[PDB]
Amino acid sequence: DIRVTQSPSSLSASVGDRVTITCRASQSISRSLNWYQQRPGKAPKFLIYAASNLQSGVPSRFSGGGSGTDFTLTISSLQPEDFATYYCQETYSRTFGQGTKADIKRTVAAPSVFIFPPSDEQLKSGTASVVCLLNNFYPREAKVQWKVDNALQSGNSQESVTEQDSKDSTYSLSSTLTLSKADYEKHKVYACEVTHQGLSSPVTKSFNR
Amino acid sequence: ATELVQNSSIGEICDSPHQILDGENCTLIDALLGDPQCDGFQNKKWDLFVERSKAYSNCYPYDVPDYASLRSLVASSGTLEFNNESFNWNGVTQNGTSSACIRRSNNSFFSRLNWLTHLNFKYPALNVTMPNNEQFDKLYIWGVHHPVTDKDQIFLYAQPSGRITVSTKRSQQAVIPNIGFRPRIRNIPSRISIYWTIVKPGDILLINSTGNLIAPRGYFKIRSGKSSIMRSDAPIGKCKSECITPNGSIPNDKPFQNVNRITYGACPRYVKQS
Amino acid sequence: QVQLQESGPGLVKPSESLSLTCSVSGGSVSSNLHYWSWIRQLPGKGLEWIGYISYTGSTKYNPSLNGRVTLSIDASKNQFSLELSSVTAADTAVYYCARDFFEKLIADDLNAFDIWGQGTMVTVSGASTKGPSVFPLAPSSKSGTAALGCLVKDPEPVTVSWNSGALTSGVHTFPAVLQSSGLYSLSSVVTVPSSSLGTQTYICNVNHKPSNTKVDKRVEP
Ligand SMILES: *[C@@H]1O[C@H](CO)[C@@H](O[C@@H]2O[C@H](CO)[C@@H](O[C@@H]3O[C@H](CO)[C@@H](O)[C@H](O)[C@@H]3O)[C@H](O)[C@H]2NC(C)=O)[C@H](O)[C@H]1NC(C)=O
Ligand SMILES: *[C@@H]1O[C@H](CO)[C@@H](O[C@@H]2O[C@H](CO)[C@@H](O[C@@H]3O[C@H](CO)[C@@H](O)[C@H](O)[C@@H]3O)[C@H](O)[C@H]2NC(C)=O)[C@H](O)[C@H]1NC(C)=O
C-alpha cells in the first residue's frame, strides 16, 4: 500500500517558460523516485534517477529535486520538443503516477485546408469516403462543416486529430464523410466549411461530380 | 498518564553535557570515506552525531553492503581518528581521481582511499601484509570498483576480470567486481562497493588480490563507549540536558514520555498514548 | 545497445489466457543482478506496472491483478513471456517489455526501468479479423503547395510509411476512428511541393500484422 499523486493533470506554458510538475506521496520514500518522458507514439524515456540524477538523454534543461514526500520536476526553459506525458514512479510500490501531459502555449493560428474526393477503386465497392484536411492549425478548437449540395450534414462524418509534432507545435485534423455509392451520385457539390480563429472568415473548399 | 508524562520539547538539542557533532550536508559514511565536502570532519570525536536529512554525497558513487552495521559501528566508537600507513603498492598507479569527486576545483577522490590503476600496462597480483602491532582494534575501510564496460576494466586494470581477497586470522573476505552499465549518478554509471575489515592486536591484514580494488590509506582507531548516532533536523543550542530526542532536548523529570522512542542518555521510558 | 521487441497476438477473445513474448537482442538474458518486467498502457489510467522476474525466476506481481499474471524466462532463446489469464474488456491496452535494474545501495529504493520496448497493442473485443482497404487521396494540383495521402478503411492500424521510409518530414498519420460498422478507419497525409508530381512517384506502405496484409498503393494525380 503506497499512494502517489501527480499534479497537475495538464497545463500549458510558452516556449522558454519554467514549468514545474509535482509528485506527492502519502508515506515518506526518502530521496527516492524517478521521472520519465513518453512522447506520442513512443515508449517512455529514462530522464532522472533518485529524484535528482540526470541520465543519458538529458539536454541539461531538465532538473529534479525534493526529499521525503514532495518531489518536483522542473524544466528551466521549456522547448517545443518537450511536448510529452510525464510520469513519476515510486519504487517499493512499483506504482506509476497519474501522468502529466502539457503542451506549448500556441502562437496564433494558420490553418491550411484541403479536400479529397473518393477514389475510383473505392466507388466500385459501393462506398464513398470524402476526406477533408486541416493542416498545421493551432489552437485545437476547430469546427468542420460538411455541405452536400450546400446542405448541412451531420452524423455521417468522422475525424481524427494528431498532436504537436513538437517542431512547430501544431495540430492537424482530417474529416472523412461516409455515404453510399447511390447517395454519392445523387449529388455533385461537396464542400468542407472550416471555422477557426486564425481565419477571419470560414474557408470553404469544394469540388464537383 | 497526564501529569507524569513529558509531552513537549524545547525544539533544539543541547550541546551539553554530551559532545554533539552536527552533520550538516554530510552523513557519517561520507565523512568516513573522505567526501570533499566532509573534509572538515576528519579526526573528530563525538558522544552523539546527528545526521541531517539534507545530507547528500558529492563524490564518486559508492555502495555498502551491511550499511546499518558499519554506520552503527563507527557511531558506537565515537571517533574518526585515522593514521596513514605505508602500504607499498609496487607496480601500480596510485591516487586515482574522478571528475565527479571535486575538491579545490580539481579532480580528486576519497581522502581515505587510494584508487589503484595499472602501470606501464602491468598490474601484478598484489599481496600486501600489514600487521597490527598495537594494543587497540584497527578498522580498515577498503572498496571494490565496478567498471561499466570491460572496455574500462581493460583500460583501468589490464585484466579481463579482477578479484579482491581480504584475509585475517579470524576473517576472510572475497569479492568479485561486477561489470555493468548502471543509472548515471552525477553522470557516472560505475560504482564502488565498500567493505570493512577489523584486525585485533596481534592479527595481520592480508590483501590477496589483483586490483579492481579501492585500497585503504590506513586504519581508524576503534573505541568502545556510549557513543551513538541519531537522525534529527532540530537545531543545536547552548543549553544543558541529559536527554536528547530527534524533536529536541527534553527534561527527565517525568518517569515517562511520548516525545519520541529514539532517545539518548538517561531518559524516561516511552509511552504509547498521552 | 540492447533492443527489446514484443511479439504476440493483437486480438484476444475474453476469458482466454493472454500471452506475449519479449525478445532481447545484443545481450545475455541471464544476468547476475537483474529483473525483467511487463507494463501496460491505457489512455486515462497512464502506465501500470504488472510483473517482474529475475533470471532465477523470482516473482512478485501487482496486487491489483489477483495473481492472474504469470511471467516466465527461457534462457535458451533470450526470451521472457507474459501470461494473463481470464482477460476482460478492462485488459485491452498497450503492453511494453522493459529491462530493469535494481540497486538498493543505501537508499533502499532503486527500482530503475532502463530500456523500454516498442510495444504491442492487445484487444479484448473478441469478434473477428478482417484486413483493411487502402484507397489513395489525389492532389489538387493547381500549381504553391499540394497535399496527398492514403485512406485506410476496415484491430490495429499497423505501420503506414511513405516510399519505404524515404519521405518522413511533413507526414501526419491520424489516429483511427471507430465507425458504426465496428471497423476502424484512418488516413495518412503528406505535403509535397506543387511542382514535383508527374516525375515523383509516391507510394504509401501499409502492413497489417493481425491479418498478414501488406499493401503498396500509388497515389497518382
Ligand atoms: C548544503 O548544500 C546546499 C546545496 O548545495 C547549500 O545550499 C546552497 O549552497 C550554495 C553554495 O554556494 C549557495 O550558492 C550561492 O548562492 C546563490 C543564490 O543566492 C547561488 O546562485 C550562487 O551559485 C552561490 O554560489 C546557495 O545559495 C545555497 N542555497 C540555499 C537554498 O541555501 C547549503 O549552503 C549547504 N549547507 C547547509 C548548511 O545547508
Ligand atoms: C598520494 O597522495 C597523498 C596525498 O597528497 C600523498 O601524500 C603526500 O605526499 C607528499 C610527498 O611525499 C608529502 O609531502 C612531503 O612530505 C615530506 C615529509 O618528509 C616533506 O619533507 C616534503 O617537504 C613534502 O611536504 C605529503 O605530506 C603527503 N601527505 C600527507 C597528508 O602527509 C602521497 O605521497 C601520494 N602518493 C603517490 C604515489 O602519489
Q: Can you list the domains of chain B with their CATH numbers? A: 1-18+235-273 (2.10.77.10), 19-234 (3.90.209.20)
B185 and chain A in contact, CB less than 8 A: yes
At residue B166, the 3 state secondary structure works out as strand
At the topology level, CATH places domain A112-207 in: Immunoglobulin-like (2.60.40)
What is the rounded (10 degree) CA torsion for B39, B41, B43, B48?
-160
A135 and chain C in contact, CB less than 8 A: yes
| CATH entry, A4-104, from 2.60.40.10, 3.10.180.10, 3.40.1390.10, 1.10.8.350 | 2.60.40.10
Surface of A (156-175) touching C: CB under 8 A: 158-162, 165, 172, 174
- Dihedral sign for Cα atoms in the order C122, C124, C125, C130: positive
* Helix or strand holding residue B31 (H, E): helix B28-33
Beta-carbon count within 10 A of C17 CB: 12
Q: Is residue B131 within 8 Å of B168, Cβ to Cβ?
A: no
Residue B181 to residue A116: CA distance in whole angstroms: 52
ω into A8 cis (within 30 of 0): yes
Distance from CA of C3 to the nearest CA of A (A): 13
Q: Kindly state the DSSP code that residue B147 receives in the 8-state scheme.
A: -
Q: Which of C32, C106, C112 sits opposite B63 (nearest CB)?
A: C106
B182 and chain A in contact, CB less than 8 A: no
Residue A207 to residue C98: CA distance in whole angstroms: 50
What is the rounded (10 degree) CA torsion for B58, B63, B69, B71?
0
Residue nearest to atom 5 of ligand 2 (CA): B95
For residue C15, with 0-12 CB atoms within 10 Å meaning exposed, 13-18 middle and 19 or more buried, which class applies? exposed
Q: Is residue A3 within 8 Å of A26, Cβ to Cβ?
A: yes
Structural domains in chain C plus CATH codes:
3-122 (2.60.40.10), 133-218 (2.60.40.10)
DSSP string, B39-86: GGGTT-B-SEEEE-TT----SS--B-SSHHHHHHHHHHHTB--EEE--
Q: Is residue C219 within 8 Å of C204, Cβ to Cβ?
A: yes
At residue C165, the 3 state secondary structure works out as helix
What are the backbone dihedrals phi and psi of residue C84, each rounded to the nearest 5 degrees, phi first?
-110, 110
Beta-carbon count within 10 A of C19 CB: 15
Spell out which residues line ligand 1, taking CB within 6 angstroms.
B 24-25, 54
**What per-residue string of b and e applies to A90-125 under the rule 16 or more CB within 10 Å gives b?**
bbebbbbbbbbbbbbebeebebbbbbbbbbeebbee
C101 and chain B in contact, CB less than 8 A: yes
At residue B30, the 3 state secondary structure works out as helix
Residue C187 to residue C136: CA distance in whole angstroms: 9
Instruction: Say which ligand is closest to the CA of B95.
Output: 2
Helix, strand, coil: what percent of chain A each, to 5?
5, 50, 45
Q: Kindly state the DSSP code that residue C10 receives in the 8-state scheme.
A: S
A49 DSSP β-pair partners: A53
Which residue type is seen at B173? Q
Residue A47 to residue A53: CA distance in whole angstroms: 8
For residue A6, with 0-12 CB atoms within 10 Å meaning exposed, 13-18 middle and 19 or more buried, which class applies? buried
Residue A194 to residue B257: CA distance in whole angstroms: 74
Residue C49 to residue A95: CA distance in whole angstroms: 6
For residue A205, with 0-12 CB atoms within 10 Å meaning exposed, 13-18 middle and 19 or more buried, which class applies? middle
Q: Which of A55, A58, A63, A70 to mutate to test the interface with B (most CBs of B within 10 A)?
A: A55
For chain A, residues classed under CATH 2.60.40.10 are: 4-104, 112-207
Experimental method: X-ray
